[PDB]
Design an enzyme around this catalytic site. Structure first.
Site, PDB file in Angstrom:
ATOM      1  N   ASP A   1     -40.423 -35.630 -29.986  1.00  0.00           N
ATOM      2  CA  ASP A   1     -39.400 -34.984 -29.194  1.00  0.00           C
ATOM      3  C   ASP A   1     -39.609 -35.240 -27.692  1.00  0.00           C
ATOM      4  O   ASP A   1     -40.515 -34.692 -27.071  1.00  0.00           O
ATOM      5  CB  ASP A   1     -39.380 -33.490 -29.500  1.00  0.00           C
TER       6      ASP A   1
ATOM      7  N   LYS B   1     -38.122 -33.443 -21.301  1.00  0.00           N
ATOM      8  CA  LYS B   1     -39.233 -32.541 -21.097  1.00  0.00           C
ATOM      9  C   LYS B   1     -40.103 -32.961 -19.890  1.00  0.00           C
ATOM     10  O   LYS B   1     -40.094 -34.112 -19.429  1.00  0.00           O
ATOM     11  CB  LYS B   1     -40.133 -32.544 -22.355  1.00  0.00           C
TER      12      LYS B   1
ATOM     13  N   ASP C   1     -43.989 -32.168 -33.372  1.00  0.00           N
ATOM     14  CA  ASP C   1     -42.697 -31.517 -33.632  1.00  0.00           C
ATOM     15  C   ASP C   1     -42.132 -31.749 -35.053  1.00  0.00           C
ATOM     16  O   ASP C   1     -41.008 -31.322 -35.381  1.00  0.00           O
ATOM     17  CB  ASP C   1     -41.680 -31.817 -32.536  1.00  0.00           C
TER      18      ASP C   1
ATOM     19  N   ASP D   1     -32.648 -30.596 -25.949  1.00  0.00           N
ATOM     20  CA  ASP D   1     -34.025 -30.307 -26.358  1.00  0.00           C
ATOM     21  C   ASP D   1     -34.062 -29.110 -27.358  1.00  0.00           C
ATOM     22  O   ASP D   1     -35.134 -28.701 -27.773  1.00  0.00           O
ATOM     23  CB  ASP D   1     -34.873 -30.061 -25.125  1.00  0.00           C
TER      24      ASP D   1
ATOM     25  N   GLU E   1     -32.893 -29.391 -30.341  1.00  0.00           N
ATOM     26  CA  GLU E   1     -32.398 -30.303 -31.401  1.00  0.00           C
ATOM     27  C   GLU E   1     -32.841 -29.918 -32.810  1.00  0.00           C
ATOM     28  O   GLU E   1     -32.192 -30.273 -33.809  1.00  0.00           O
ATOM     29  CB  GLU E   1     -32.892 -31.750 -31.128  1.00  0.00           C
TER      30      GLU E   1
ATOM     31  N   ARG F   1     -33.025 -27.030 -34.394  1.00  0.00           N
ATOM     32  CA  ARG F   1     -32.081 -26.133 -35.087  1.00  0.00           C
ATOM     33  C   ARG F   1     -30.818 -26.879 -35.507  1.00  0.00           C
ATOM     34  O   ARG F   1     -30.195 -26.530 -36.512  1.00  0.00           O
ATOM     35  CB  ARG F   1     -31.757 -24.940 -34.196  1.00  0.00           C
TER      36      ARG F   1
HETATM   37 LI   LIG Z   1     -38.091 -30.283 -30.880  1.00  0.00          LI
END
Ligand SMILES: [Li+]
Ligand SMILES: [Cl-]
Ligand SMILES: [Cl-]
Ligand SMILES: [Cl-]
Ligand SMILES: [Cl-]
Ligand SMILES: [Li+]
Ligand SMILES: [Li+]
Ligand SMILES: [Li+]
Lengths: 457, 457, 457, 457
Positions: B230, B237, B248, B307, B309, B311
């Site tokens: 991620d 990030k 992740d 970010d 993502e 869900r």
């Molecule tokens: Li993530």
């Protein structure tokens, strides 16, 4: 080299250095009109100021140049920007030694530099006579420094890995040096760390490998960081941090320039030049934090900062260089990040694994007035490069000791038995100073070259 | 499982737990030399410390281990790092119940873990006897936890969607479970939200769908977030935030590990495992803030944070899971962002749409000493997910209630009539603690498995 | 246009504007029940509030609308959100002039807008009679503003360069205007600056060129910034900064909408519409800080901020527009960055190279109550765009004068002899206000159109 | 005024402006030696360059100054830094009108400025003859601009409220103007908003109130922001933001300087000067976010940004000014925050509540070449100043429209029936430009003074 004149003539306009303390006595040797003019002009010998003195005809008789000292030389670098039009000459008798005379001649040329690939610029109208005795040495240096400046100044779009490889081949042809370009699949297999860093760019990564000289001579291997553009990768730089990043191939330019001087001067060595040439890009294929990159040395590197990529690509070039057990390895790498510039922008950092080498380079720095300063390969800090996953990480746990950290990383790839010097350089002039226009710049090379001449002749 | 010995022998070295209060009376039962040595060594029963006691020959007679309490168990996890070389054994009589004896045996194994895929490491020289009565259960757990740790620890470059799919197929073969991989065009059409998130990566997105068990048995469906790396996407990030992002996909590893335990122990359920496997990358094809993503449930999601993502990809897996009206759905997802870790790194958050399920999992947590804590599906906060364009947004308007927000998002895809539990986990040890090496880690699974055994046997 | 009724009837429910000072005298003209109800309701004429008055049957007799003033008009924009169901009508006699009557009719329609491409929404149940005398003008404006709102509101994924080109062709067909799309290799050669900015996107860049009208008529050329999504490029935006970036093609939407009004009203001009349509993306091919971009005007631009891309693409469109020596050029561009919004979100900035043009547009702004404010092409600030490498940079050295800086940049591409106006607009409603729903919005167009009608009829 | 000479003589060295186009024809009128020298020197008329021409004796005959245009004037500001030593003179015949001649004389003086209160500096050796006809006007302006520069340049430690009050009293004595200082308890009671802002400083707040002139004449009241140092208060500034904050009393310096010109030139007005003088400090007594500050106007202000303090202290001064129903009020305030400098550092923003006043000031700006630009008192933005607790807040909800926001705040304290102009100025030269040394600077005053002379004579 069109800032110089090569046909000697008896009608050039003399340029004479002057300090405040000598001006009164000098004036006493001049005619009435000259004494009145120098006084009327307000010239008192301040460094970088000039006094253009007229003949009785109104033509230019002489130019006085205020100097910081008679051995400083860079004051001459400001001449092209202030001199009236004409053909000028320096006088050997105005200098303590031919060395200072030659530095003044070169400084004049360095200050005449204009990068004009993207805009039209009026050339300077003052030219300086270059005596035959100093012509080759001054020309060799000027053309080499101009090359370094040009490569650094060229926008990344027009100076990617391929263009850098082409520049190396252009230099090689003049001396019939051999050049091998390692690309694509062979690079992916043989130099995996160079490949991992550069694989995200639209312009693929490569390794440039040039050789020249007698196979029986001592091996001197030069390595230069060729990061044509550094975005920082996924650990993306701030805009201020990315603005000058076309210069992150400055180490490659320096290594190529030093190679060129070695060949021009026919130093009796077996020369090899290794340049990893890549773009550190952001895109679908970017190498990531936490990724483990294989190396030519068969060590594993855990990537903890994608923006500490220069040392990663250099590790593979160094692993290759060491296989031949060369007499000397010298690498040039550009610094990135305001905090890592511990010695400021105008003082290259030197690291060396052998004390004699470091001391000899320091001595050369003083003799050439080409500044450098030694930083330590402080062994306790190797602990900062500890990885729980791989053999080592590429960056440290803290924001301290940045420079030392990079150098210690590289040391993992070079035996203490092979003399090795690593130069961290800024390769850029932030401000317009005499002889030093804003943009790319060469540093440390005169010192290194002096050392090589002393060591190998 | 080479940290254990399976052939019973009468010459193993005993390891005995000890607390300060019991030491004086215990010493009174020992010979003179033993009493002198324990006193001379300074051992007083402090948790995690040991006292290696010599035989008169100088060989090792016994090892005392200081414990926090006789029912804590994790002190045994530190043994491999401190034990001298040898074949050791625990004594059943030193524990209140077989359950604590088994936890101690397992903790020993968990503390013997070393991730060695990228560096050579010397294996620990202490091994522990594993009695036949506890061999299967301890081995099943150790191998499953090792798998979870290995998958999380593997750098993203070597653990992308394809590698994750391969790991699932490897586990499936042992039990002749069936695996379907949904990729490319079928994924784009049938699971558009999984596709939108992963389309920018150089490694394409997919959905892994495993099934096992009697078709007549109650359906238990496990869902795990497989974000292999991620970057945050266009809402990139910070470097500190991206450093551990190979983890992740920890939810996917957990869901796969739980599936493996269910199959190893032949729980009488119809098991299904769904893992959306993608990379959330930055590149030319990245999904964007303001984009509206279609879903398998036919709801529209306005992307307000690229970010958030996990869900989004889980929504499609959940929409698929619910179509079968399963008896239970359990999802595992990793937390991202320092502020969202409301319960800290070592306490998994549990959300559940039915109170009986939540309470039963809480009870299981206490019985297994595998901590978890319930957070609420606080309905008024659904307003934070309001969109002016789509059915809902994927992230909230503020920086508060992060965890609740993600869980409420997912609830839009699961009927209140289907029992559903969602676990937000950190899946990583930041510090080296007894039995818990820095890197990937399994959590919540023992509690969940206990619940499943109680519910379905 | 389904918020309006076009068949005249004698049973519509009247809507009457009212101010506090007139209410007492008005009440005296009404029956007992009406006087009691207005008093019992608490209605006192506050702007935006209404009083629905019953007939003796309980059906609706009339609606009073509190207005800020009898000439403000936007209070009517809030009606759809508060009106009970029904067929309503305004009374011409309640307005000072037909102009205010027409603005009220239009405001009603503007407040009935709902963007429903991604979610189902219940349409408003109040409709307003539109008299034949004002039907064409109100419809022309409503449909054009709806188009602008729709294009801006459409997520970037569904509104890339191709979709924008398609929208232009759809508008062109209604008037048999001609459209040329410049793409791929011809764009790369002929419009290099448009190509450089958009080359990193997965959806390639293009230039849309529409023409309409009598070839003998004065040439009016409209230019609009079509940045379909702006990530900022390598100089990446913050998440808050990128959230609304689907609107960075608002200038293109405005230019297309203005073109549509010109064609609908058959203004006697030779119309040309130029829209550079690109995505400013992050990826392997992204243009970089320090890169020098060639232009159609043959000037070189040093990129000092990849997020100041709008002016770069506009430079090529402007260079093309000027070749025809048009009577007028008007460009529309969206503002990016909180600090650059010097006039706030609801006040478009106007720059113009000729004072008569600027003053005429200011006059038009006052006549139409469509606000705009002039900012200066302050010539000393051209120094902020100085480059050491190229003809100029695309962004300034400081964080001050952002708006002026962009406009001065564009001025380098337009002769002072060609009347030119540049509009910097926000193109978005941050808050839900009467007649102005959150999302895309049209601004400045009524003023500009009024000017064109005055100038060319 | 020691940069000027006042005794007329026939032996001064002429300084003559020159443009490239006129040089060839001019040279034709000169002797042989002069023609040779100008050609030999390389002088071609570039703006800001000079050509010092020798007499046959070697003394200085004349100096040519390249000018941007014959009416620009600021090129003369660079003379002190480049001129040789001597007594020089300008020629009236070289200018289109006495106005440009006078501006050139003044520019020379402005460029001779050196702030030497904290370091020794060698004074410039070139002096210029100042003709009697222009002596008073040039001296009055030079001394007033020097005063403004000096006050702004003085470090805050040596220029607190008391020192500012003393400076005002020093100016008042020369014209027997009356000065009242409102301090301590009377300030706390009568001007609570001035007190609230300044109460945390170690140097207490005060209000300076100066009056001069015939009591029967029209009242012109000047108001200036005297924030001697601005730390930002509890909403503390960044270091970059606080570095120049000794200049946050620039408005007070401007108001005092304008008052001085009015008195020097005996304008027929009743002058009043009001300066709130405070430090915005951080300490135990600092006013806080959320605090409600009472005002002299009896309005309540909720503090939403302690760093928007200037408008808060000005509100009390304005409330006092309006009580007399003056003919005109003009306030000067310095801008703070990079984003609020919408017009950049060199273009003062003008706000005015009456259009005739604004237009007259704009006209005066053009006549004097003292730039200013009007920004709007855009009434819809009053909503940004809404408070749930007090009558209004002191700062807006967003980071847009900063300048407009401050001006709209102040408008709450001034009736639309009283002509009022508010100037937002930067009051500082960031770069060394001809006639404009780095540090404090006067702006807008020549325009305002011209307006006053036109209006009141
Ligand atoms: Li993530
Ligand atoms: Cl470069
Ligand atoms: Cl992983
Ligand atoms: Cl859009
Ligand atoms: Cl000051
Ligand atoms: Li780099
Ligand atoms: Li943009
Ligand atoms: Li301030």
């Amino acid at each position: 080299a069109d800032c110089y004149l090569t046909e000697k003539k008896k009608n050039f306009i003399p340029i004479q250095p002057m300090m405040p303390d000598e001006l009164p006595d000098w004036l006493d040797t001049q005619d009435a009109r000259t004494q009145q003019w120098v006084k009327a002009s307000g010239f008192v010998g301040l460094a970088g100021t000039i006094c253009s003195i007229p003949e009785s005809t109104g033509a230019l008789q002489r130019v006085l140049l205020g100097v910081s000292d008679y051995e400083y030389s860079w004051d001459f670098g400001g001449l092209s920007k202030v001199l009236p039009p004409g053909a000028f000459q320096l006088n050997r008798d105005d200098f303590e030694d031919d060395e200072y005379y030659e530095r003044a001649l070169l400084a004049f040329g360095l200050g005449s530099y204009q990068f004009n690939a993207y805009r039209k610029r009026s050339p300077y109208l003052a030219k300086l006579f270059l005596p035959q005795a100093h012509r080759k040495r001054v020309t060799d240096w000027l053309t080499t420094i101009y090359l370094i400046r040009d490569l650094i100044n060229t926008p990344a779009e027009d100076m990617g890995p391929s263009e850098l490889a082409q520049a190396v081949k252009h230099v090689a042809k003049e001396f019939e040096a051999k050049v091998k370009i390692i690309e694509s699949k062979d690079l992916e297999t043989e130099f995996p760390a160079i490949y991992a860093v550069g694989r995200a760019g639209s312009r693929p990564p490569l390794l440039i490998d040039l050789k020249w000289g007698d196979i029986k001579a001592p091996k001197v291997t030069l390595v230069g960081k060729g990061v044509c553009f550094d975005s920082g990768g996924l650990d993306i730089k701030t805009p201020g941090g990315m603005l000058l990043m076309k210069k992150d191939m400055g180490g490659a330019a320096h290594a190529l320039g030093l190679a060129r001087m070695i060949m021009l001067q026919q130093l009796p060595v077996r020369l090899r030049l290794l340049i990893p040439a890549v773009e550190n890009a952001i895109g679908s294929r970017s190498y990531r934090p936490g990724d483990v990159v294989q190396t030519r040395a068969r060590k594993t590197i855990e990537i903890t900062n994608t923006d500490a990529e220069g040392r990663v690509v250099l590790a593979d070039a160094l692993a290759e260089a060491v296989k031949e057990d060369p007499d000397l390895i010298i690498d040039f790498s550009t610094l990135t990040g305001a905090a890592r510039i511990a010695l400021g922008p105008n003082l290259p950092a030197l690291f060396a694994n052998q004390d004699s080498l470091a001391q000899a380079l320091i001595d050369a720095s003083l003799k050439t007035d080409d500044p450098l300063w030694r930083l330590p390969l402080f062994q306790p800090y190797r602990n900062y490069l500890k990885s729980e996953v791989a053999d080592l990480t590429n960056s440290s746990q803290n924001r301290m000791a940045g420079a030392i950290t990079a150098a210690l990383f590289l040391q993992h790839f070079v035996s203490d038995q092979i003399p090795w010097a690593h130069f961290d350089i800024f390769a850029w002039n932030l401000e317009d100073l005499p002889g030093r226009p804003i943009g790319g710049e060469a540093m440390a090379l005169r010192a290194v070259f002096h050392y090589l001449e002393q060591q190998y002749r």
